[model samples]
Target: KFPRVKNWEVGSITYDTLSAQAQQDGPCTPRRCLGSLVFPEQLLSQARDFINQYYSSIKRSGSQAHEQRLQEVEAEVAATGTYQLRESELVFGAKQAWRNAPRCVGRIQWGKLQVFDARDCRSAQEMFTYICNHIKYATNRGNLRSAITVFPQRCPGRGDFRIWNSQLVRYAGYRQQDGSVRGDPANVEITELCIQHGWTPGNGRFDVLPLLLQAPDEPPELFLLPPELVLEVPLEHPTLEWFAALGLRWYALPAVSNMLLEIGGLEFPAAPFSGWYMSTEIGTRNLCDPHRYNILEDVAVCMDLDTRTTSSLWKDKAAVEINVAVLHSYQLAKVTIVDHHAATASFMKHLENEQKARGGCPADWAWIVPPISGSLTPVFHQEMVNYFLSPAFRYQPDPW
Candidate 1:
C-alpha cells in the first residue's frame, strides 16, 4: 500500500495534466509505474510519486493527455539507464580515447557522497593542501601569444587529409624566478602557452570537453605557466613565453550552469544498489567552498578531446603548472555501489584507518547527496533527476 493523499486540490490543474500524459505512453511496468531499476531510493522516489500522484488526480477530475506525457518521459529515463549500463570508462592523463571507446558515466548507489578532511599538502604525492596557491600576474601582454608549426601536407600515409599544427594550445602565467611562491612585483613575469578547452574545428558539438597544452621552445617542450600576467620574462620555460598571444586566462573554460538531462526511462526488473561517482574539482565551480556556491552541474566527457594525434612529437611530454586563480586545488572521487561482489567492507575499513593516520575529523568531507530516490513506486517523474543535477554543481565539500 502507498501513503494516503491529503489534499487533491493542492495538486494544481497543470501538474495533474502533465503527470497523466507522461505515464500513459512511457516505458514503464504493467502497474503503470516507472520500475525500480531506473528510479533508485533517494530523491528520485519522491519526485516520481509527486509527478504521478499530482497528475493522476487531475486526470480523475477530467484532465486529458496527462498520463501519456508522463509515460513518455518515464520511458526516456528508463532508456537512459540502459545507456548508462554499457561500459563506462575514464581517462586520467593526456591520452584521448577513440570514438568506439568505453562508457564513462555511472550513477551512485545513493545520490550523495561523504568526504573526509581535505587539506593542502606538502608535495604532489601527499594529500593536496591547496590549489592555485600563488595568485601572481604576468609581466607583459606579449606573454599571451603562442606559436604553431603547421606542416604543409600530411606525412606520407598519415591519418587525416588536412595537416594541422604540431603544437598543443598553450596559455601563459607569471611566477617567481625559482618557481616558488608568488613572484615579486618587478620579477612578476608571465609564462607561456597553456591549453584551454574550446570548440573543435571539425564538429560543432559543444557538449564535448577536450584537453590542450602549451609547447615549449625546447625539445619535448611542454611546460606550465600562469594565466593572469602583466609583466614579461626574458628567460624561456618551454610552456611559458614572454609573448602575450601565447597565454590564455582561467576564465575561458566552458561553464554549464544550472541544467539537467532527462535520461528519459526504460523497463528493468530490480533497482541496482551500485552506481559510480566521479569526484573532481569540476564540482568546485571556481569557488572556495563548494557547499556555499552551488551554481553548475557536473559534466561527463566520454570521447577524448582529440589530443592523441597532436602530442606525439614531444620528448618530455609532462603536465606543466599553470598559475590561474583556481589552477591548483582539484579533487576527484569515483563512487560506486558495492555489495558482496564489491569491496565495500574493505574500502570502508581502509577509510577508517586513513582517518586515524591523518588525524582529522570525518564529517567535514562527506559528499553531497543528490535529491532523488531510485525506487519502485508510482508517479514516475524526472523531477528527482533534475534535483540531483544541482548537487553536482553545489560547492559543498564532504566533511569526512
Candidate 2:
C-alpha cells in the first residue's frame, strides 16, 4: 500500500486514501468497501495483474489456460481469502520480479537467474540447509551465479520464516576495549545476537557472520556458515604490492538474505537472492563506510598521499586506487564483477531495450547512480520513474 505525493521531498509527501478510493472505485460501492482492507486488497490487485501479465507475456492472453488460472485464483480468494501459486507460476513470478527490479543495475541477466523453491520448509534447521545449498550453487567455484531461494510464504496468523543476516557472507564486528570495532561495524548488532545465541565470534578482520535464522513461532536460531561454502577473493593491486598486505578480502557472492519476494498477493518474506558484485559495492560502501572498515586513510597513507588538507584530495585518490584493486583482484581470481561505468552502461542499454519492448521502465535514480563518479555514468543523466509492480522484491524489517 502506498500514498500519493506531490513531490519527492520527505516533509512534502501526503496521503489521501479517500481521494484514491474515489478514483479507483465509484463513490461508495462494495468495491470501495473491499478496497478498505489495505493488505488483502493490495495483494489481490497485484496477483490479478501478475496473472494477466504472465498470460500476455506468453502470447496466450485469452487462452483457456489463462482464463482457467484466473478463475482458480478468484475462486480460491473468494473461498479462503488467499490464493496459492502453482510451482510454474512461482518460478515465472520470481524471474519477472528480478526483471522488473528497479534498483539492480544487473537486470540484463534477469532471465538467466536460477530460482529455488523451498516453500515447504517450516523449521530453522531446514532453512539453514536450504541456504547452504543456495550458497554452494551460487558460489559456483570462483565463477558466481545469480540465484534466489524462496522460503515459506506468510500465513494468516503466524510468523514468517526469515534470515536475519543482511547477506549470507558478512564479516563479524566485535567491539574492542578501546571503544573501536575490530571488524565489520555494520554487523555489530547481529554479531552480538550470534554471540548471545552460542556462537564463538572470531577475533579477525574477516570473520564471517553467522546466519540468524527464525522459523515461525520459534525462538531465533543461529547457524554458522561453513567456511568452504563461502568463496572470497583476496584483494591485491596490479602495481601496488603493499595493497595485499592490508589483509583485505571480500566474499564473491553478494547474497541479499532479508528481502521479501512479493508474487501477486503471496509474500515470501525470506527469499534470499544473489547477484554478482559491482566493484563500488565493496570498494566504496563496505570497506569505505565510516562505520564499517573505514580504510581510506590507511590506504591513502600507504600511497604516500598528503593527509594534511582537503585540497590534496587524498581520500579521493585512495578510493580510486582501492576500487582499482578490487576490480583487479576479482578479475585475477576469475570471479565475475562489473565496474560501475560498464555496469551502468549495460543498464542504460537494458533501459532502452525495455523501452522498445514496453512503454516505460521503472528505475530508482538514487540506486541506478553509482556510489562514486555519479555524473560520469550514462544512467546519471537519464530521467527515471519508480513504481510498485508485482512480482516484486522489497526490503522488510529485521527479524531480530
Candidate 3:
C-alpha cells in the first residue's frame, strides 16, 4: 500500500511508492505520525545496500565490476571490521543525503552541491585549513554555493573528529551578570565553551566565535576564523530608511558544522555542510524567535506600530518587513538568498522532479512551511509523507 498525497490548490493526488522503498520503519504506521521528528548499524548490509544504490545509479547493478566492489568491501570489513568508501562513493552519498533531507527547503539545488573530500585531515590545524578553504570556495565573494567537507569518520576504537560550534560561523552570546544573553541566545553554551577553551569573548552583539576542532582523543583546539573569509550582509530595506540603522547583520553562509554525516554505515562526525540562507530563516525565525535575537519588538517600535495587541498585526507587519530587508540587503550585496515564496515554489518543482526520478520525496509539512507565511506559500497547500532513509545528515550528541 502506498501513501496518497493530495494538493488542495491543484485538486491533484500523488502516490508515495518511494515510502515503500524505505529500508527502516519510522515511529508511524497506519497510526499517528509525529512527523518533522527525529542509528548505529551493521556494517555489511548497509555497505552492500549503499554500494548497490551507487552502482545502480551508474547502470552497473549486477555487473562484474559491481560484484568486485562488493567483495572488496566484504574482505575489508572481514579484515578490520570496517571499510572505507571510495572518493566517488563519498561524493554520491553526500548528494544523496542532501536530496533525502526531509526538512530542507533547498533540496532543489541538491544535485549541484560541491563535495570537499578532507578525509586525509590528520590534525585540528589541517582540519582548519580544509574548512577555511571550503568557506572560500562556497562563499565565492557572496555568490554562495552549497558544499560539504567530510572529515575522518568515527572509528570502532577511536574518538570522533568534532566541530564544537553548531555552525561554522556563529555569533558569540555573552551571559551578562544580569543573566540575560547579549548576543545569539541559542549560542550561549558554545560561546562559553569557546571561552573555557582559551578563546577571548567578545562584547558586541555579533561576535564570530572561534572553531573548536578536535582530533581523535585530543582536547579541542581553538581556531580563529579569518574575517575576510566570512561574508556578511548588513540588512537594509529598499523602502524603510530606518531598517539599516538597527545594526542587524547575518552571515552569508549557513554552514552546519555539528551534524553527523552517515554514509554506508560510516559516520563522519565533523562533516560541515552549508548553503545560502532562506531569508525567513534569518528574518522570521532568527531575528524574531523570542529565545533568539528577538528583534520584532525593537523593529515594531522603530516602525511606530502598535505592539500592545495581536489584533493590530504589528508582529506580522514587522516580520514581513524584516524578511524584505534580508532579501533586499543580500540582493544588494550580491549574496545568494531566497525568500519564502520563491523557496517554496522551488520546492514544489523539486517535489515534481523527485516524483519523476524517484517514486516520492520525503517531506515533513511543518518543517517545509516557512515560519512567517504558512498559508501564503505553495507548500501550505501540499501534503507530504515523511519517512527515514539511509545516507543522511543527522543530529548527534553535542561534543562538550
Candidate 4:
C-alpha cells in the first residue's frame, strides 16, 4: 500500500487521479514500470510524497503557489490525459534526483547541476543534437561541469527513447580471434550493436563509439560524434615518464546516458547526466579491471617489480601508481577530477548537512566506498541507510 497522504487536498487529487487512471489503463506493473524491466511503482509513490514535501519545505503548503502547481499538473493531465512537468518543475526535479541519488558519492555538487529540457525532441537526430550539447558543455574544455539533459517523457502505448551507449563518451571494443577484446571490454555489446546498425567501427584502442540513438516507435539511428566535440586527456606522470609511453587516454567527461529520470510519477527514459570523475573510477576500474585494459601486470613489469607472484603485492602497487597517474594527468591537463580521499570527505560533509536538514542521508556503502582503499576514508566507518526518494535517477534495461 502507498504511504498515508501528506497534503491531503493536493495529495488526494493527484494520487487518486493517477492511481485510478493507472488502474483503468492497467497500472504499470513491476516488469514494465521504468522501461521493460525495473519497478517504478515505489518511485511513483515517492514522487507524489515528494510533491507534498517540496511544497511544505518551501512554506507554500496549502498556499496559492502550492495549489497553483497542483492545479497545473491536474490541468495538464486532464488536457493531455497524462501528467507533464513544466520546465521549472523538470529542472527542480532533476537537481533533487542528483541530491537524492544514494549510489553517488558526489552529491555535494548536486545544487550546481545544469538541467536541459529536450522533451519536445521527436527524432533520433534531435536526441543526438541534445547529447552533443550536453557533452560540449559538460566537458567545458577540461574544466568539467555537472549536467543532465532530459528527453521526452515515457508515454503509454508508445515506444521509449533510449541512448544505447552506457556513457556519452566510450571506446569501441572489437572482439579478436583469441577470445579477447581489443578496446574497452565494457562496451563490446554496444559496439557490436552499433556495427549491426550500419556504423563503421574504428580499429583503434581509443576509437570513440558512435551513438545508437532510438526515438519512440522508430528504428535506432547511429550518429558519429564529432572529434572536436569530445575532450580527451592523455595519461602521463610527473616523475615516471615511462607511464606516458603506455599510450592510455580517457574522455574528460563521464556522462552516463542510459539511466531513467523519474519525477513526479513521470519517467524520461533517455535523460543523460554527467559529472566529473573521481580518479579511481578511471584508474582502478576502467584501466586496471581484468576485463578492461588489464594493464596492472604491464605496469608492474615496467616498474621492474616482481610480477611473478601475487604475494609481492605487485598488482596492488601497480594499481596505486595507475591511480596516481590518472590524478596527476587530469590535474596537469587542468581538468576537474578529484581524488577519492577528497571526494569521500566532501560526501561526509554532505551527510552531516543532510542529517541536520533532512534528518538522514541515503547512501549505499558498496558504491560510496571507493573501489581501492575503502577503509582509508571516513565513509568506511560511517553508517548509512538506503531508501526511496524522489525525484531519482534509476537504471533501466538496455534498449537492444
CA-lDDT, candidates in order: 0.21, 0.83, 0.91, 0.81
In candidate 3, what are the lDDT values of residues 1-400, reduced to their tens digit? Answer: 8888999999999999998878676666566755545432367999999999999999988998899999999998898998999999999999999999888999999999899999888989999999999999999998888999999988888877999889999998998889899999999989888999999888999999999999998999999998888898898999999889999999999999999999988889899998898999999889999999999999999999998889999999998899899999999999998888999999999999999998899988888999978999999999998878888988899875
Tens-place lDDT digits, model 2, residues 45-90: 7678778888898888989899899889888887877888898888
User: What lDDT is obtained when candidate 2 is compared to the true structure?
Assistant: 0.83
Give the alpha carbon lDDT tens digit for every residue of 1-400 in model 1. 2112221223412111112222222234457643333222132443344344435434542245555545544564465422211111011000111100111121111212111111112222121111111112111122211111111111123221110111111122233458642211111121221122232222211111121221111111222223342121211123333212322222222211111112112111110011121222222322212232221211101111233454542211211111111222111011111121123233333333423532211111112111111111111211111112111111111111
Q: Candidate 2 — worst ten consecutive residues by lDDT sum?
A: 18-27
Please estimate how well model 3 matches the true structure, expressed as its whole-model Cα lDDT: 0.91
Candidate 2 accuracy as TM-score: 0.88
TM-score quality measure for candidate 3? 0.97
Instruction: Output the number of the lDDT-best candidate.
Output: 3
TM-score of each: 0.18, 0.88, 0.97, 0.87
Which 10 successive residues of model 3 have the least lDDT summed?
33-42
Cα error, candidate 2, residue 348 (Å): 0.9
C-alpha lDDT (0 to 100) for residue 312 of candidate 2: 90
In candidate 3, stretches whose alpha carbon ends up further than 4 angstroms from where it belongs are: 29-32, 36-41
In model 1, how large is the Cα lDDT of residue 343?
30
lDDT of 1: 0.21
